[PDB]
């Protein structure tokens, strides 16, 4: 499938590109219902 | 703060961990306390103590 694996330093264009959102609010679980 | 921590935000005892509810979560309750609210317009609960 792959062949080699390459390191570099991660250019913020490619963490952008990495996440699938942002996260803003620093609450987890709601402790009660297991809704996040 | 940062160190006592901020209270309930739905609660007494301003100061402290104390497990409180999420902000992310009483937006969402207000909103659906608000549209509950108007839609029924029921009087508050402080109407139902006068």
């Given at each position: 499938?792959?062949?080699?694996?390459?390191?570099?330093?991660a250019?913020?264009?490619?963490?952008?590109?990495?996440?699938?959102?942002?996260?803003?609010?620093?609450?987890?679980?709601?402790?009660?219902?297991?809704?996040? | 703060?940062?160190?006592?921590?901020?209270?309930?935000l739905?609660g007494?005892?301003?100061?402290?961990?104390?497990?409180?509810?999420?902000?992310?979560?009483?937006?969402?309750?207000?909103?659906?306390?608000?549209?509950?609210?108007?839609?029924?317009?029921?009087?508050?609960?402080?109407?139902?103590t006068?």
């Amino acid at each position: 499938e792959f062949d080699a694996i390459k390191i570099a330093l991660a250019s913020p264009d490619m963490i952008r590109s990495w996440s699938f959102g942002e996260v803003k609010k620093p609450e987890t679980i709601n402790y009660r219902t297991f809704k996040p | 703060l940062e160190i006592r921590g901020a209270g309930e935000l739905l609660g007494e005892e301003q100061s402290g961990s104390m497990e409180t509810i999420g902000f992310s979560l009483y937006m969402e309750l207000l909103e659906n306390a608000v549209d509950a609210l108007k839609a029924g317009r029921e009087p508050s609960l402080e109407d139902l103590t006068s």
